Amino acid sequence: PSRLRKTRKLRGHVSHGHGRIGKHRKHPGGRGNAGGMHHHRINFDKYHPGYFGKVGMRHYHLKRNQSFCPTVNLDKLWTLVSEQTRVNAAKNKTGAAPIIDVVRSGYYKVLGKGKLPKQPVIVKAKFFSRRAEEKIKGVGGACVLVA
Amino acid sequence: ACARPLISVYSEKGESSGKNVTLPAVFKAPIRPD
Amino acid sequence: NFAELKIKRLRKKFAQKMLRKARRKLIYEKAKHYHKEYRQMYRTEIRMARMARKAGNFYVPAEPKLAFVIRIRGINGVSPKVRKVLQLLRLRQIFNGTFVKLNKASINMLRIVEPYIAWGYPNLKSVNELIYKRGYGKINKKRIALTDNTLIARSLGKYNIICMEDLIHEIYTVGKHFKEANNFLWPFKLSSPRGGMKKKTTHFVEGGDAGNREDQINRLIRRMN
Amino acid sequence: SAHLQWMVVRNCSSFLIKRNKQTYSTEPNNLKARNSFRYNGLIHRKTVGVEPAADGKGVVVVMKRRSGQRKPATSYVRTTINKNARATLSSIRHMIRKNKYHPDLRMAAIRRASAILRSQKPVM
Amino acid sequence: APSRNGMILKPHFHKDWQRRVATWFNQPARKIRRRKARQARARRIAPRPAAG
Amino acid sequence: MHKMLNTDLSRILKSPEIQRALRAPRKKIHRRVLKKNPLKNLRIMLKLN
Amino acid sequence: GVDILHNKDRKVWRKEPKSQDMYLRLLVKLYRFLARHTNSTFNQVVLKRLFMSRTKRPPLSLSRVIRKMKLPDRENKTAVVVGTITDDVRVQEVPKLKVCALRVTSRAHSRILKAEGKILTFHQLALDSPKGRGTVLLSGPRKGREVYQHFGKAPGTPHSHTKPYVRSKGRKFERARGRRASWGYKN
Amino acid sequence: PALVMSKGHRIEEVPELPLVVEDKVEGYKKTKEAVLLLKKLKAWNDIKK
RNA sequence: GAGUGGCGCGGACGCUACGCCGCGACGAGUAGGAGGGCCGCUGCGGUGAGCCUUGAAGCCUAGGGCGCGGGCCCGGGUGGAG
RNA sequence: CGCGUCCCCCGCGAGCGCACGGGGUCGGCGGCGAUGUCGGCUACCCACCCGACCCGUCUUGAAACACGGACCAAGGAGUCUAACACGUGCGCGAGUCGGGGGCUACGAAAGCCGCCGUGGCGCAAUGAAGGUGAAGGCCGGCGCCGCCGGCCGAGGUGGGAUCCCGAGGCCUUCCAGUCCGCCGAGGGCGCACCACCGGCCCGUCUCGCCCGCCGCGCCGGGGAGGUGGAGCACGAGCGCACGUG
RNA sequence: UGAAACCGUUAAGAGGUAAACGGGUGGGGUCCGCGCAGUCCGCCCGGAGGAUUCAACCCGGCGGCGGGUCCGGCCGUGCCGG
Secondary structure, eight states: OOSSSSGGGGTTSSSOSSOSSSOOOSOTTOSTTTTTTTTSHHHHHHHOTTOSSOOSOOOTTOOTTTTOOOEEEGGGSTTSSOHHHHHHHHHOSSOOOOEEOTTTTTOSEEEOOSOOOSSOOEEEOSEEOHHHHHHHHHHTOEEEOOO | OOOOOEEEEEOTTSSEEEEEEEOOGGGGSOOOOO | OOHHHHHHHHHHHHHHHHHHHHHHHHHHHHHHHHHHHHHHHHHHHHHHHHHHHHHTOOOOOOOOSEEEEEEOSOSSSOOHHHHHHHHHTTOOBTTEEEEEEOSHHHHHHHTTTGGGEEEEOOOSHHHHHHHHTSOEEESSSSEEEOOSTTTHHHHSGGGTOOSHHHHHHHHHTTOTTHHHHHHHBOOEEOOOOTTOOSOSSSBGGGTSSBEEOTTTHHHHHHHHO | OHHHHHHHHTTOOSSEEEETTEEEEOOTTOSSOBSOTTTOTTTSSSOEEEEEOSSSSOEEEEEEOSSOSSOTTTSEEEEEEOSOHHHHHHHHHHHHHSSOSOGGGHHHHHHHHHHHHHHSSOOO | OOOSSOOOOOOSOSSOGGGGOOOOSSHHHHHHHHHHHHHHHHHHSOSSOSOO | OOSOSOOOTTTTTTSHHHHHTSOOOOOOOOOOOOOOOTTTOHHHHHHHO | OBOOOTTSSSOOSOSSOSOOOHHHHHHHHHHHHHHHHSOOSHHHHHHHHHHSOTTTSOOEEHHHHHHHHHSSSOTTOEEEOSSEEEOOTTOOOOOOOEEEOSEEOHHHHHHHHHTTOEEEOHHHHHHHOTTOOSEEEOOOOGGGSGGGGSOSSOTTSTTOOOOOOOSSOSSSSSOSTTBOSSSSOBO | OHHHHHHTOOOTTOSSSSOOBOTTGGGOOSHHHHHHHHHHTTOHHHHHO
16 A cells, blocks of 8 residues: 555655755665674674674585474473373273374474373383483383384 | 344245245354454 | 432432531631631731830841742743753743742742742732632642632642632641642733833842842732732 | 444445535435434334335334344334324324334434425425 | 664675566466366376376 | 454443443533632622632 | 643553454443443453553463462452463363453363353453452463564673574574674673 | 445345245246346345346 | 332433543644545545436636635536546 | 530521622614615735745855746656565464465456475574583481482562452431442452562583493483573464554 | 647726735725525414314224243253253
8 A cells, every 4th residue: 555655745845754964865874784894883793793703613515304303392292192192091090101102293302391290101202301201200101212 | 142043045936935044153253344 | 109218318418508508607717717817917026026126126027938939031041950940830931920938948949040030928918819810729630710619628628728718828827738738729820010020131139020029029919910 | 233233334334425524324214314323224123214105295104123133024114194293293202202112213203204294395 | 774673684686686587477377277288188098097 | 253242232231230330420511610800709709708 | 931841741552442343342332431430440451451452462371371360369260361362282181260351262262161161251241240340350471472582782782681683593693703702702 | 134235235125134045046047037036035126226 | 228127191402432522731843753634646346226418527717615724515608428 | 596405614497589609691772775785704906004035955054146947738756576673453373374286257366175284484492513402399218318209399579550358337206137239447369561589401611429231431311509592480473464664 | 628838809907116925904896695674483372264173982903012920932152861
């Protein structure tokens, strides 16, 4: 909508909302990211700290699939398997624990953030954190490794 | 409201046939002109 | 069968009616007692002087409790400190008037804005007409005219200032609730002095209008009110 | 409901007619004929209409019946009153006061009918 | 020139890009073009699986 | 889903539940009053004093 | 000539919602009437919140409507929200909750109602409690939003733990000169 | 009914305002059949409009 | 505020709630910002059982008006198809 | 300005009417008028009095001996695309979104897909990287220490809109006495948010002791206390539209 | 169609401080009110008229409603039974 805009309310004025002294000239600061170490240094220092310079090692042919390891917390570990299993786990008499194949749902590591509800599990996760191990052992479960 | 009245069905001669459809819940969806 | 609630609604109206009559009689008798005070106040100052004069001594009368400060200069080209002190006095417009009770934290402010005010010690008749003619109350932070006593009684009733006369008594005889009674009064919208100003720019001492005019504020209050 | 389908109609109905800093509503059962919640003749359950007859003289009174409101064809009972003026204005007062039928439109209907019997009276 | 807290962003429009703008008004005609060919092939490969 | 299920605030606002839990309607309109004087008008002065 | 600065003599609050939706605007008409008439200060705060923008009434998670209703002296009380109730999945057991919200997410409905809870709207909260008596008026976290991490003292200012606007983060996206003692300086 | 008249449709004389007809209507092949239906459902005053 | 206890068939207006009403105070303004336009323009979707060869658009006007204003509506003349 | 009763010195009478009374009425009148007068603020022309320099522009400052403009009509200048930011509207909500593909005149539209959610962004951060990756205390079995065990357990303080409790009190020839409503000294639960204090994860530093084992090592794990982080501390985002920069 | 600049002519008006301008009236026009005996509306009081003519009363019809608690349907972002 061109009619809702500021351009329509600037018909009848003169400078069109770009100053009478400092006129709307073409590029009075240089084009793009110019003067980043010269006359736009203070903007870059105050708002983009670290912009200039190198750090760390160059890795030439980086493929993003070699370093693929999507993580799930213990906070939402039970949401991977149906709500029926968590119901059927507690009520039944045997003491059989349900299996949460974390790789089936599309995560390769189990991090240990949430309070894990006090009933056993067997977690077939590809990787584990040290806490995520301790939480499952504490509730009374298995940290089954898989590849 | 959440009531669904009993919607009649009309014969080709414009007079009422015996059949009644229950008004679909579609017709009681919130009227948003926005 | 309505015979009860017919008379019960009248019994209410009579109790509301007889209560106003008791409130009217109080307002009448508070007004009669302040007349008796102002008499004794006015009389004893002449009395203390005559017995000073008989003995051969001097009665140095009580340095006044109460001043009436009128802004004489305009709103244009004014010092920052002078702007602040004039707007703490609520003198935000030319020929605005407020009562200012004297002390140390009053006069060292009034001497700092001397060139922008004409002030002095108001009369009893000066306090009357300023409260009667130009009397407006800050009720709900709105400048509402004091036309019934139930506007002063509603804002100032918690300090037992329940009529026009109680307010005048509270200002003139600077009461324990002067602040609340004076801040209730909107800064007085006075007209231009009908007769002319002597000289706005210079002090009253040097044939001007500005600064302390001890007895003589009352002549210009009547010139402006 | 009344308050719902007002908020759709209030600014964008086909009957709504805006010009000359004035707003009207050309509905079949608006009387005073102005854009209002009260006087809108589509949107309320109970609606009083006052129209002149299909013949020359008289006033017809359109009472929107309580039952079939999703039924447009059977929703209105029309009663033509071809009498003297004083008893036409009475009948309309009695239809509204003594049926409790939307008593906010009691005086507007009597003023309209009055201005319809004045209209069909011959000019000199 | 940067005004305040902005993103230090780099548009790739320093070349003659307007000459090489690929517009997609072909798209709905293309989807019919592919579909007409898919049908005409399926009717040709007559009792055989359509998908191949 | 509906944001409100009863859209009729004719019937809601004159329901016995709401109508019970209001204050009294202040329908009386108070226009401004003239400032008469002390010495001009006697029985305005008799009202104040 | 009166020395009044006309800078701050227009108050910049909402006196209606900017939204044109007629279900929210009918709720305002109801709480316009209740707020001014009922002396209860509940309905006044609700009316204000019915006006406020999407950001200013943020989504209260179900696990706050658990937690802040579990608190002492709040038994058999109705949780009032002017935002929306979103089903927190990292809570397992859900109590009986009496709920008033503009929206509830289709997950949180099935969560609350199945666990013997009741969901109301603000036309119902009106008929149930016109003064809003026996209500816990809750709100979601307003500073929750991602946008507040970029606000405050500028990123690259000493002791400003502020998130900078970076195209895409990594090892070579604003890590050197203003972030390391090795490269120039470190704020 | 009110919204459809506010939209501008002449439904004053329509039977029910969800005008549901039989599945005999989908068997029609001529406009003279289509006209006579809209006469009898009294939708024709909208076609005439 | 509620309970057991000793004839005359009548009443103005209103409330497009984005509506209506009341009361106080205030009003310079370049650059600049924002809001509201029942301000204007040309096309589109709707709608107004809109207007129009018994005269559309346009154009002229010492005619009548309206609006703080942008502009707009009428009367007359010209015009021929929107 | 009564007395039926309570003591210090000797709860409703009826009318009338005048008004310095919450903003003007008259229950006063009077000339005139069909071919020459009546009304018409504006608009047409003229005259008089006062005011009154020529606009646009850059400029500390323009009527300027600053520049552009003889006159008139038509044309004539903040656009569209991409990205980013923030505000606002809508939808869904720890998700969200088909945009690419596919299926079935207007219609190159619309509707549909979910074993088309690939993928994007969000849901996890930190580190140059190897990599690592987000509460505990208690009561015991061997004035303790790593296993054995058990239950309860996502902080604290201060201020906090809103609710909550209700000491008491809101009246018809009494006085008890109950149901509701309303006010309230004071006291509590405290939303968001803010400051503060502790906690936790990653990097690093310092000090220090103890564990684990198919591979006992230049192995792996852990602790207390500083500190670096665009973190956690019961999600807010995603898509769309609109505005501004 | 036939605008404006610009020109002619006709009609009216005025003209020694270039013209034009704002504010205030006056004068002359052109036209308009299609002016020029000047408002209707209730209710009531009197007169002389007219009319199929009210209240009531039946008879059929139609609608609103609530019948504290008549019968039976139908629907439930309501459950509890098979």
